[PDB]
Design a protein around this ligand. Structure first.
Ligand SMILES: *C[C@H](O)COP(=O)(O)O
Ligand SMILES: *C[C@H](O)COP(=O)(O)O
Lengths: 249, 249
């Protein structure tokens, strides 16, 4: 009795208007016949184009990042600005931003909290590095990341949260986690949520896997009992995202 | 024989589609009767709206930031993506990004270089802090910032560069630099450019002032011989930006 799956396309910093037009038509022409929330997260400047072209009723549009408040923050996009333009999903804490762009656990947690307060659905990203994995620290790391987020949330806010477990060593590298690796982590995360947040919350929570998901490995990942779908980078730029969606059947 | 002035609106992280519609109509209905490049820099998600609504022929649209290359940079917008959507102006190195968002001199210089290579007009921001000012380090600081940028540029690339001198203590604080303060810095910057880059380059270079510019203080700033216009934050969200433009006559 899994909760509704999610298939989320993180386009990252990629696209042209011609390429996006073509890919959106692919997405539109793919009839989805099961209950799944599809998400596409274009770059900020592409949000209006995607809003204008995307019509598949299974989809919503997400931002790839945000800051909490409007103001004197040259170059950034705030949560109120996104809400006003009709975007009410956001990806927060992607490894890329934790690594390159200074986002500590505290900063990610604050952003997630603020997003929930503003009515967003949030895909909050967590995951260990290769060195953490090899040091047998996977569980400690993902639980610390999750706990940091949880410390700024009320119980009710969790209804807006989606966790995305993405081992850093699997992101963009062609080294997907095995089904067993992912399931082990999703199980421990769900147990933590059950015990620390609530048993109801844990049963409803979507915990997505990401890191080198493709159309050929997705269904076997999805067969694991605590995997609720995917956060997809490279493969989401391609027509084979259709089969990743259908791997959540 | 000043070069063509620039009046640039840095909206920062502000706007709604309703507020932007209204302000763009104000800008459109203001007939400008002198040679000036007006620039408006909306948030990324607002670029398409501004592109659709802005018609005043004196204007171009700028990004408030960018990264050099497309790829696995969740949340960021690249220079090729901006070029493809029709944006070929960018503000780089704003204090807000140097201060909050990790942009060192090296990072700013690299971004400016890459933007010039990709055909952008670049508004490159420099300026000292209050503590640097009080330590008599203003000239050392702005010349170091400018030199860092220059080290990554060819002579020809300077035709695409605009400098914006914004003392950090003047940004958003209601403490504008005096005309004499700004002119002293613009003079020393232009002399450095003349001697280190070329006398032709220096004569053509626009050096803008920013930091608490408003419609009432702009004309007296513009009267100074080495001030070529303005990078405007708060006042650019208001109808009085019209009079800031006209203060460059
Ligand atoms: C959530 C991570 O973005 C996935 O990137 P991948 O290219 O799918 O590895
Ligand atoms: C270039 C600086 O953005 C200007 O901000 P101000 O609000 O005009 O001080």
């Amino acid at each position: 009795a899994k909760p509704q799956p999610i298939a989320a396309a993180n386009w990252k910093c990629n696209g042209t208007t011609a390429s996006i037009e073509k890919l959106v038509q692919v997405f539109n022409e793919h009839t989805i016949s099961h209950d799944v929330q599809c998400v596409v997260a274009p770059t900020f400047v592409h949000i209006p184009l995607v809003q204008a072209k995307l019509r598949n009723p299974k989809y919503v549009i997400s931002a790839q990042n945000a800051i909490a408040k409007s103001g004197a923050f040259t170059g950034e996009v705030s949560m109120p600005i996104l809400k006003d333009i009709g975007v009410h999903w956001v990806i927060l804490g992607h490894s890329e931003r934790r690594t390159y762009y200074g986002e500590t656990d505290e900063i990610v947690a604050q952003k997630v909290s603020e997003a929930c307060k503003q009515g967003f659905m949030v895909i909050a990203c967590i995951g260990e590095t290769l060195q953490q994995r090899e040091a047998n620290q996977t569980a400690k790391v993902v639980l610390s990341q999750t706990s940091a987020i949880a410390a700024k949330l009320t119980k009710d806010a969790w209804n807006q949260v989606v966790l995305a477990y993405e081992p850093v060593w699997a992101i963009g590298t062609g080294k997907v986690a095995t089904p067993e690796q992912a399931q082990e982590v999703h199980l421990l995360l769900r147990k933590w949520v059950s015990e620390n947040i609530g048993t109801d919350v844990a049963a409803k929570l979507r915990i997505l896997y990401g890191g080198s998901v493709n159309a050929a490995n997705a269904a076997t990942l999805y067969a694991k009992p605590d995997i609720n779908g995917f956060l997809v980078g490279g493969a989401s730029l391609k027509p084979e995202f259709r089969d990743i969606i259908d791997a959540t059947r």
